[PDB]
Amino acid sequence: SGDDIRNQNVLATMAVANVVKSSLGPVGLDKMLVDDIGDFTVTNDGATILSLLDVQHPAGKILVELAQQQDREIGDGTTSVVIIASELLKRANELVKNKIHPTTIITGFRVALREAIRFINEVLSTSVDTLGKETLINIAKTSMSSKIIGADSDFFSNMVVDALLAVKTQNSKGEIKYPVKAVNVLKAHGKSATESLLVPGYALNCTVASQAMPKRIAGGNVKIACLDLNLQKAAGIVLERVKKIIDAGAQVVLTTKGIDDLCLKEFVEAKIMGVRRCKKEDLRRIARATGATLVSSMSNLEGEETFESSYLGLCDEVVQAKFSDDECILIKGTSKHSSSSIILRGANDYSLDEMERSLHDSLSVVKRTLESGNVVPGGGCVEAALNIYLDNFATTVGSREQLAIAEFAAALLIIPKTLAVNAAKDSSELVAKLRSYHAASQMAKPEDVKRRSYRNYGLDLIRGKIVDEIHAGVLEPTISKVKSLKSALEACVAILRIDTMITV
Amino acid sequence: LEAKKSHILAARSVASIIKTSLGPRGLDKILISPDGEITITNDGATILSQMELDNEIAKLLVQLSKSQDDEIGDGTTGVVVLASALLDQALELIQKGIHPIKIANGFDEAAKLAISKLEETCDDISASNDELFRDFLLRAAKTSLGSKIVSKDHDRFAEMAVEAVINVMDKDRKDVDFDLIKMQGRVGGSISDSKLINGVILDKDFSHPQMPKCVLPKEGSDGVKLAILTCPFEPPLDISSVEEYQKLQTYEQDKFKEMIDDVKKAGADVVICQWGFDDEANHLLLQNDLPAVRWVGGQELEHIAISTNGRIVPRFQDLSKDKLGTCSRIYEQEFGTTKDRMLIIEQSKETKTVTCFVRGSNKMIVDEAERALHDSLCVVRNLVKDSRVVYGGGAAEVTMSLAVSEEADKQRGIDQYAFRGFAQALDTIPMTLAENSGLDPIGTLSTLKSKQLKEKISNIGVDCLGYGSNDMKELFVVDPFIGKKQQILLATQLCRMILKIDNVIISGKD
Amino acid sequence: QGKGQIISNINACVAVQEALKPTLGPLGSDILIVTSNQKTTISNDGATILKLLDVVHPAAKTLVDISRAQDAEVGDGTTSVTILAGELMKEAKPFLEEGISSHLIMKGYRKAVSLAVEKINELAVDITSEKSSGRELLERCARTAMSSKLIHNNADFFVKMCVDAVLSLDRNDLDDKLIGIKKIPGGAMEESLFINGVAFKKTFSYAGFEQQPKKFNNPKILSLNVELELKHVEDYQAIVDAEWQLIFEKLRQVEETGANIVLSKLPIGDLATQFFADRNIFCAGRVSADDMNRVIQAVGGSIQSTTSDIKPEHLGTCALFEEMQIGSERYNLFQGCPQAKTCTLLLRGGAEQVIAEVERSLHDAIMIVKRALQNKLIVAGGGATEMEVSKCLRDYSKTIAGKQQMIINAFAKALEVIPRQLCENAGFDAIEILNKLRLAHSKGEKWYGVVFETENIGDNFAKFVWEPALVKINALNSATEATNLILSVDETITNKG
């Protein structure tokens, strides 16, 4: 008990930090995990690093257990909990030796959270400033610089974003979120990489079953009937199903299991657009895009037909435009579709499989950045701007918590400090300059007196400079950083409340 | 701050010695001399003087206690016990979290009260009568003698002290010099052979009993002229024929006569020399029937010069009648079986140096009486210096602790921590007096505090010596105001000196 | 070896700081120092403390040497050198472990001391008559130095002597040897006797009273060194008179000089007073050459060991020489000597250590007045100057970017070790005083500092708590050099044997 258990508690949590310290950052160093079986694994995944970490000292079971809740509860934030907390505890022991009662230390850290949450809530940004300016282009460039298309990512990333800019959906009662499986993109050998075209609408993976049938029907307002059962001879009846298409009034017909020679020609004579053999998953999205409902079998109390005005969808304009070895069906708009399409041009499908690798990641990451509404200026901006603001907060209380306000604030530099150490760049130069760039942002900028007095400058780990992370495009969720700090002090208080350990 | 615990616990090592010596019923301690001699003493002044402790903080406590001995003389263990109590109470106050500087500042603010409370009980002795001053002075002197073998003859030794000091003081100036009083004692005889002698006793036999051991006043002539000479009675050898030696031996007698003629011509009646006499030097002095004394140190020779207004004459021919010391008479006095053959030089009146003749059966008995005579004389000299006295022994320490406690009830602040402890510390004196007397250690404190308030404010003390009641006026237990002031005053200096030491840096010899 | 040699060197200097940290302040603590002579001294005087530390660690020898220079060059502030120098090294521990090099640290410390000296220059206020009368310039300062002491009730007694003690000196020539103190046991504090000049306690170890009139309105002081006391069968005497006649004529050779006062470094006995009583010459041997050289600086005489070569040029005369029974002992005094620029105080009190507390309480008050006349530029006391430099260096770290920003920030943090130890040694709430002082200083008041009367901050100019500017400047410059000496060591090579 006493200063002995307090010193032992800190050494335990610093040893835990020695494991995650080197893992912070996209360019960090990995740790090798070794079991008694004889297997080994090497990863920078913070959740895996902590999950397999064997902690014998009982204090670390608290720190790790929190991070276990952090991953299971949020899904990210596992590295910041250990690094942030270990610095809070390292500096707290100095307050103990300076005759600061553990209760006062805890009280002030909680007051700092009440102040810090307000600061973070004020200095954050919303899901805006992403159109017409390279906020999602540089975010996409970040994901795309690791791809073979990297050299041409300026041309490809324009489509990644511009397509995603139009697929805003309401999801669950107006979440305002983008569809993950969307923007039907075609890997094609057509032309050079930089000439890939962005399509203003959706392309169902198919063409007009017969080149003789008309390809654009009802330019203003068109109804689409999606059928599964074939029109093929099993023949006047399966042909008559076209006469039911005529009487029921389907202008674009999506027949999945194929169309008879008489049905194909009957569509021509009927001036109706016929389509054969579409992808089932796209047809289900067509059911949600235009509304054309795939009829797997014709029953409806002995009904056999497209079911006039029932199973038909609604679309604005359906066009098949020839783009030089690309003849597919385009969907303009409608009441609710939220769909689009991209043409990929390049060397060949094996090279366009890099676009499969690129868009799988790039569409996922850009969507994740737009998944969160409120976003955080990354790169130590949320840590360093707190460093500056919390220094001025020292004047609000100014009694006994003033010492803890400082040590809490200074502990927030462990993140921009560790980001630099793990990046090989000069840690003392980068951190100090980060403070000075955020220092002046609190002086005249909030007075609306600014020539170039603008914050959101953060640590660039690649070019080795401090850059405006808005124009550079490094963002992190506000739910993550706010929950990160909330979690961090939860363990900091928990460890600082341990003043006795009895072994029975 | 843990060094404050080391320093306070160190003081308890000192206190655990001295505590037990407090009281007229005190417990004695063995002093083993570096040579192996055993001395038994009840006086913490002699205990602290010979006590060798390696703890450096304890070495400070001794050096500071020397200051009470150099001044009042009798307050040795008073400041020791009080200091251990101030430090013991501080140990608890330190645990309560009080910074040492606030502990010390409070001990001063509380002390300034107790000093003024003591003043409420002062009374004057000499305001009445010279006979009643001698009476109350005698009544007080007997209080100091109860711890010595004189407990039988305490009246015989107390009757000495009255005139022993009065003879050497100045009634108008009221300033008496202790160096005017000598204690001259020897191991032997009995304590009833101790005398108060108006003058000095040199313990010298005039070199031979055939030499005149005394000079009569000479029908009341100008006293007896005493020659203080710094050299032996002798002048400051190849025989090639008989005539030569006839002078060689005589030349001593030529100087003997020259020195004797210097005696007779100068008028010197007794010749007192630093070194011995020659066999024929006595013979030549026996031819002229002139007394003389040999082997006398300057301490004894000055007592002649002091009482007789004499001079230390450097050589036999440097004698001058104006430089010869004039005494009323000189005679060799033996007491009982005393074979030392002592001589007494007196003015037959108040001398400028007086001597208390002390004899005792054992060396311890003699030193016990002489040590009491030092303090018994100091009892008188302190009563002469400051006539303001209290019937306070055991009562003032309680009276002061009662007042400090009453003040704590009026503090209402951080000072309540210190004022409450200052009284608890003052109570260690009546508590220690009780434990060292064989009485109830707690019930003595309650009985004393009750009688001084529940009955009324008066002088109520301990029963150490043994007596039917607590009345300090019936026992006539009296202490000087200046004494109790220095005890409580130096105690706070002792506390500050200890509490203000944060590090003890002990260096070695290279 | 390597960067860890610095870690070890800092740890050593920290040990020195921890021993010296309780000594800052007139309310501070003492250290009990046992010397190899078994001479125990308990003192809060950092000059004495540093003299006797006997530090052996090579790094601490450097730290102590720097502080001993502060004493010879300035004379005050030796404690502030050790505390300031040590904390500037203690605050460097987190910088070394983060990889900051010795040049990067030292270059920053040199940058800070440059920034600070200039802000000390701005704080400097030239106090000659500026808002101060000549008498209260010294009086109110000395009254402050003695406030809330054991001599508090006698403050008028000691300030009346103290202010005029220094004012009685040569205002052009200040020197500690011109104010001497005797430890006179016996008497109360207010019984202390001030001597217009120099006095000595008559170490003459023999008798001889009722002879040699000892008081002179116009003495002629002569200084000797040698002892002029003496100490066929009839012929045995001749060897005694042979030597006696020699020294007896030498005693006459003193009379031939014409001296009324004869001094000696060796014991003088009654056999020497044989002649001096016959010719009536006061003689006092075993006298310190310091008081004898003060006679040389008082009456303008000369010391001649022997008696024959003495001419009137060796004699000097004072305005009053008197032997007094004051002090339960005979003391000889010189007052108003024609050449004297000196004075002495005989301290009387309840004990030698009671005198020591009055002595060093006075010794400091003497230095307080000493530098009131020496120094024209003063700076704020009570740590207000340390907070002044703290605020300004904090502002420089706001406008300076780079590695210097963090290093300068550490300099500012360490500047608060001075007000910190002033708070802790006085028993105040260090957390409260440091915070209330920092904020109130940042509101624009440059004179707020530690108030010892009531736990609070306030104007040390109004309290007349003044410190010399060069004390602050030379100490700060010295501390920076000390940190440059310790932090610059990479290796210790010891030639053993």
CSV table of N, CA and C in Angstrom, one decimal, chain C residues 229-328:
chain,number,residue,atom,x,y,z
C,229,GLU,N,58.1,38.9,31.0
C,229,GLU,CA,58.1,38.3,32.3
C,229,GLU,C,59.4,37.4,32.4
C,230,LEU,N,59.9,37.3,33.6
C,230,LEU,CA,61.1,36.6,33.9
C,230,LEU,C,60.9,35.1,33.8
C,231,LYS,N,59.9,34.5,34.5
C,231,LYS,CA,59.7,33.1,34.6
C,231,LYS,C,59.3,32.5,33.2
C,232,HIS,N,81.0,29.1,43.6
C,232,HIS,CA,80.3,29.4,44.9
C,232,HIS,C,78.8,29.2,44.8
C,233,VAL,N,78.2,29.0,46.0
C,233,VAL,CA,76.8,28.7,46.0
C,233,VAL,C,75.9,30.0,45.8
C,234,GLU,N,76.3,31.0,46.5
C,234,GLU,CA,75.6,32.3,46.3
C,234,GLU,C,75.6,32.7,44.8
C,235,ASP,N,76.6,32.3,44.0
C,235,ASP,CA,76.7,32.7,42.7
C,235,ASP,C,75.5,32.2,41.8
C,236,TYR,N,74.7,31.3,42.4
C,236,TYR,CA,73.7,30.7,41.6
C,236,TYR,C,72.6,31.7,41.2
C,237,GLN,N,72.5,32.8,41.9
C,237,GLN,CA,71.6,33.8,41.7
C,237,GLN,C,71.9,34.6,40.4
C,238,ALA,N,73.2,34.7,40.0
C,238,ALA,CA,73.6,35.6,39.0
C,238,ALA,C,72.8,35.3,37.7
C,239,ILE,N,72.6,34.0,37.4
C,239,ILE,CA,72.0,33.6,36.1
C,239,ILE,C,70.6,34.1,36.1
C,240,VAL,N,69.9,34.2,37.2
C,240,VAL,CA,68.5,34.7,37.2
C,240,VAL,C,68.5,36.2,37.0
C,241,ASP,N,69.4,36.9,37.7
C,241,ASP,CA,69.4,38.4,37.5
C,241,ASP,C,70.0,38.8,36.1
C,242,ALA,N,70.9,38.0,35.6
C,242,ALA,CA,71.4,38.2,34.2
C,242,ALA,C,70.3,38.3,33.2
C,243,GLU,N,69.3,37.3,33.3
C,243,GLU,CA,68.2,37.4,32.4
C,243,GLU,C,67.2,38.4,32.9
C,244,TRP,N,67.0,38.6,34.2
C,244,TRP,CA,66.0,39.5,34.7
C,244,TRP,C,66.4,40.9,34.3
C,245,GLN,N,67.7,41.3,34.5
C,245,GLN,CA,68.1,42.6,34.1
C,245,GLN,C,68.0,42.9,32.6
C,246,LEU,N,68.2,41.9,31.8
C,246,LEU,CA,68.0,42.0,30.4
C,246,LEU,C,66.6,42.4,30.0
C,247,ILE,N,65.6,41.6,30.5
C,247,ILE,CA,64.2,41.9,30.2
C,247,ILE,C,63.7,43.1,30.9
C,248,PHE,N,64.3,43.3,32.1
C,248,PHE,CA,63.9,44.5,32.9
C,248,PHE,C,64.2,45.8,32.2
C,249,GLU,N,65.4,45.9,31.6
C,249,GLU,CA,65.8,47.0,30.8
C,249,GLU,C,64.9,47.1,29.5
C,250,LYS,N,64.5,45.9,29.0
C,250,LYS,CA,63.6,45.9,27.9
C,250,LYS,C,62.2,46.4,28.3
C,251,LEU,N,61.8,46.1,29.5
C,251,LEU,CA,60.6,46.7,30.1
C,251,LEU,C,60.8,48.3,30.1
C,252,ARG,N,62.0,48.7,30.5
C,252,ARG,CA,62.3,50.1,30.4
C,252,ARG,C,62.4,50.6,29.0
C,253,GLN,N,62.8,49.8,28.1
C,253,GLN,CA,62.8,50.2,26.7
C,253,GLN,C,61.4,50.4,26.2
C,254,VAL,N,60.4,49.8,26.8
C,254,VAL,CA,59.0,50.1,26.5
C,254,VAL,C,58.7,51.5,27.1
C,255,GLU,N,59.1,51.7,28.4
C,255,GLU,CA,59.0,53.1,29.0
C,255,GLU,C,59.7,54.1,28.1
C,256,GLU,N,60.9,53.8,27.6
C,256,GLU,CA,61.6,54.7,26.7
C,256,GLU,C,60.8,55.0,25.4
C,257,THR,N,60.1,54.0,24.9
C,257,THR,CA,59.1,54.3,23.8
C,257,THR,C,58.1,55.4,24.3
C,258,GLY,N,57.5,55.2,25.5
C,258,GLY,CA,56.5,56.1,26.0
C,258,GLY,C,55.1,55.6,25.9
C,259,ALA,N,54.9,54.3,26.0
C,259,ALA,CA,53.6,53.7,25.7
C,259,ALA,C,52.8,53.7,27.0
C,260,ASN,N,51.5,54.1,26.8
C,260,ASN,CA,50.5,53.9,27.9
C,260,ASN,C,49.8,52.5,27.8
C,261,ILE,N,49.6,52.0,26.6
C,261,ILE,CA,49.0,50.7,26.4
C,261,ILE,C,50.0,49.8,25.7
C,262,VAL,N,50.3,48.7,26.3
C,262,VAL,CA,51.3,47.7,25.8
C,262,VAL,C,50.5,46.4,25.5
C,263,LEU,N,50.6,45.9,24.2
C,263,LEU,CA,49.9,44.7,23.8
C,263,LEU,C,51.0,43.6,23.6
C,264,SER,N,50.5,42.4,23.7
C,264,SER,CA,51.4,41.2,23.4
C,264,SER,C,50.5,40.1,22.8
C,265,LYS,N,51.2,39.3,21.9
C,265,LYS,CA,50.6,38.1,21.4
C,265,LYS,C,50.9,36.9,22.4
C,266,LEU,N,51.8,37.0,23.3
C,266,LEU,CA,52.2,36.0,24.2
C,266,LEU,C,51.8,36.3,25.6
C,267,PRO,N,51.6,35.3,26.5
C,267,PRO,CA,51.1,35.6,27.9
C,267,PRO,C,52.1,36.6,28.6
C,268,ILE,N,51.5,37.6,29.3
C,268,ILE,CA,52.2,38.5,30.1
C,268,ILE,C,51.7,38.3,31.5
C,269,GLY,N,52.7,38.1,32.4
C,269,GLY,CA,52.4,37.8,33.8
C,269,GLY,C,52.7,38.9,34.8
C,270,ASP,N,52.7,38.6,36.0
C,270,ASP,CA,52.9,39.6,37.1
C,270,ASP,C,54.4,40.0,37.1
C,271,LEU,N,55.3,39.1,36.8
C,271,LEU,CA,56.7,39.4,36.8
C,271,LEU,C,57.0,40.5,35.8
C,272,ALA,N,56.3,40.5,34.7
C,272,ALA,CA,56.4,41.7,33.7
C,272,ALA,C,55.7,42.9,34.3
C,273,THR,N,54.6,42.8,35.0
C,273,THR,CA,54.0,44.0,35.6
C,273,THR,C,54.8,44.5,36.7
C,274,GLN,N,55.9,43.8,37.1
C,274,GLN,CA,56.9,44.4,38.1
C,274,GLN,C,57.3,45.8,37.6
C,275,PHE,N,57.8,46.0,36.4
C,275,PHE,CA,58.2,47.3,35.9
C,275,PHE,C,57.0,48.1,35.5
C,276,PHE,N,56.0,47.5,34.8
C,276,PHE,CA,54.9,48.2,34.3
C,276,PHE,C,54.0,48.7,35.4
C,277,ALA,N,54.0,48.1,36.6
C,277,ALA,CA,53.4,48.6,37.8
C,277,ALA,C,54.3,49.8,38.3
C,278,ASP,N,55.6,49.6,38.3
C,278,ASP,CA,56.5,50.7,38.8
C,278,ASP,C,56.4,51.9,37.9
C,279,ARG,N,56.3,51.8,36.6
C,279,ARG,CA,56.1,52.9,35.7
C,279,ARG,C,54.7,53.1,35.3
C,280,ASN,N,53.7,52.3,35.7
C,280,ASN,CA,52.3,52.5,35.5
C,280,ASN,C,51.9,52.4,34.1
C,281,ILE,N,52.2,51.3,33.4
C,281,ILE,CA,51.8,51.1,32.0
C,281,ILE,C,50.9,49.9,31.9
C,282,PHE,N,49.7,50.2,31.4
C,282,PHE,CA,48.7,49.1,31.2
C,282,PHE,C,49.3,48.2,30.1
C,283,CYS,N,49.1,46.9,30.3
C,283,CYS,CA,49.6,45.9,29.3
C,283,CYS,C,48.6,44.8,29.2
C,284,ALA,N,48.3,44.4,28.0
C,284,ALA,CA,47.4,43.3,27.8
C,284,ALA,C,48.0,42.4,26.7
C,285,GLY,N,48.4,41.2,27.0
C,285,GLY,CA,48.9,40.2,26.1
C,285,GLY,C,47.8,39.2,25.6
C,286,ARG,N,48.2,38.3,24.7
C,286,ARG,CA,47.3,37.3,24.1
C,286,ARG,C,46.2,38.0,23.3
C,287,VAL,N,46.5,39.1,22.6
C,287,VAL,CA,45.6,39.9,21.9
C,287,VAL,C,45.6,39.5,20.4
C,288,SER,N,44.4,39.4,19.8
C,288,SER,CA,44.4,39.0,18.4
C,288,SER,C,45.0,40.1,17.5
C,289,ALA,N,45.7,39.6,16.5
C,289,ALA,CA,46.3,40.6,15.5
C,289,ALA,C,45.2,41.3,14.7
C,290,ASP,N,44.0,40.8,14.7
C,290,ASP,CA,42.9,41.5,14.0
C,290,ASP,C,42.5,42.7,14.8
C,291,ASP,N,42.4,42.7,16.1
C,291,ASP,CA,42.1,43.9,16.9
C,291,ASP,C,43.4,44.7,17.0
C,292,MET,N,44.6,44.1,16.9
C,292,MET,CA,45.8,44.9,16.9
C,292,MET,C,46.0,45.6,15.6
C,293,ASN,N,45.6,45.0,14.5
C,293,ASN,CA,45.6,45.6,13.2
C,293,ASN,C,44.5,46.6,13.0
C,294,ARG,N,43.4,46.4,13.8
C,294,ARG,CA,42.4,47.4,13.9
C,294,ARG,C,42.9,48.7,14.7
C,295,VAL,N,43.7,48.4,15.7
C,295,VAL,CA,44.4,49.5,16.3
C,295,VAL,C,45.3,50.3,15.3
C,296,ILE,N,46.0,49.5,14.4
C,296,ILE,CA,46.8,50.1,13.4
C,296,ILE,C,45.9,50.9,12.4
C,297,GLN,N,44.7,50.4,12.2
C,297,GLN,CA,43.7,51.1,11.4
C,297,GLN,C,42.8,52.1,12.2
C,298,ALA,N,43.0,52.1,13.6
C,298,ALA,CA,42.3,53.0,14.4
C,298,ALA,C,43.2,54.2,14.8
C,299,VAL,N,44.3,53.9,15.4
C,299,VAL,CA,45.2,55.0,15.9
C,299,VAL,C,46.4,55.1,15.0
C,300,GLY,N,46.7,54.1,14.2
C,300,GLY,CA,47.8,54.3,13.2
C,300,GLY,C,49.2,54.0,13.8
C,301,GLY,N,49.3,52.9,14.6
C,301,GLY,CA,50.6,52.5,15.1
C,301,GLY,C,51.3,51.4,14.3
C,302,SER,N,52.2,50.7,15.0
C,302,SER,CA,52.9,49.6,14.4
C,302,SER,C,53.3,48.6,15.4
C,303,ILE,N,53.4,47.3,15.0
C,303,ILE,CA,53.7,46.2,15.9
C,303,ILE,C,55.1,45.9,15.8
C,304,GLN,N,55.8,46.0,16.9
C,304,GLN,CA,57.2,45.6,17.0
C,304,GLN,C,57.4,44.5,18.0
C,305,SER,N,57.9,43.3,17.6
C,305,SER,CA,58.0,42.2,18.5
C,305,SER,C,58.9,42.5,19.7
C,306,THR,N,60.0,43.2,19.4
C,306,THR,CA,61.0,43.5,20.5
C,306,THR,C,60.8,44.9,21.0
C,307,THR,N,61.7,45.3,22.0
C,307,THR,CA,61.5,46.5,22.7
C,307,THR,C,62.5,47.6,22.4
C,308,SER,N,63.6,47.2,21.7
C,308,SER,CA,64.7,48.1,21.5
C,308,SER,C,64.5,49.1,20.3
C,309,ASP,N,64.1,48.5,19.2
C,309,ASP,CA,64.0,49.2,18.0
C,309,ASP,C,62.8,50.1,17.9
C,310,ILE,N,62.0,50.2,19.0
C,310,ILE,CA,60.7,51.0,18.9
C,310,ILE,C,61.0,52.5,19.0
C,311,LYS,N,60.4,53.2,18.1
C,311,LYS,CA,60.4,54.7,18.1
C,311,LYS,C,59.0,55.2,18.3
C,312,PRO,N,58.9,56.5,18.5
C,312,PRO,CA,57.5,57.1,18.6
C,312,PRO,C,56.6,56.7,17.4
C,313,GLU,N,57.2,56.3,16.2
C,313,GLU,CA,56.4,56.0,15.1
C,313,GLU,C,55.5,54.8,15.3
C,314,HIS,N,55.9,54.0,16.3
C,314,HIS,CA,55.1,52.8,16.7
C,314,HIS,C,53.9,53.1,17.5
C,315,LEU,N,53.8,54.3,18.1
C,315,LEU,CA,52.7,54.7,19.0
C,315,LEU,C,51.5,55.3,18.3
C,316,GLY,N,50.4,55.1,18.9
C,316,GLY,CA,49.2,55.7,18.4
C,316,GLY,C,48.3,56.1,19.6
C,317,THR,N,47.3,57.0,19.3
C,317,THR,CA,46.5,57.5,20.4
C,317,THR,C,45.0,57.5,19.9
C,318,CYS,N,44.2,57.1,20.8
C,318,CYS,CA,42.7,57.1,20.6
C,318,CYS,C,42.1,58.2,21.4
C,319,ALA,N,40.8,58.4,21.2
C,319,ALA,CA,40.0,59.5,21.9
C,319,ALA,C,39.6,59.0,23.3
C,320,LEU,N,39.3,57.7,23.4
C,320,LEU,CA,39.0,57.1,24.7
C,320,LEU,C,39.4,55.7,24.7
C,321,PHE,N,40.2,55.3,25.8
C,321,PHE,CA,40.4,53.9,26.1
C,321,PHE,C,40.0,53.7,27.5
C,322,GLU,N,39.1,52.7,27.7
C,322,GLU,CA,38.5,52.4,29.0
C,322,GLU,C,38.3,50.9,29.2
C,323,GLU,N,38.7,50.4,30.4
C,323,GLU,CA,38.4,49.1,30.8
C,323,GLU,C,37.2,49.1,31.7
C,324,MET,N,36.1,48.3,31.3
C,324,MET,CA,34.9,48.4,32.0
C,324,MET,C,34.5,47.0,32.6
C,325,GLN,N,33.8,47.1,33.8
C,325,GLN,CA,33.3,45.9,34.4
C,325,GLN,C,32.0,45.4,33.8
C,326,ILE,N,31.5,46.2,32.8
C,326,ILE,CA,30.2,45.8,32.1
C,326,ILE,C,30.4,44.4,31.4
C,327,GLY,N,29.5,43.5,31.7
C,327,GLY,CA,29.6,42.2,31.1
C,327,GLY,C,30.1,41.2,32.1
C,328,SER,N,30.0,41.4,33.4
C,328,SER,CA,30.5,40.4,34.4
C,328,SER,C,31.9,40.0,34.1
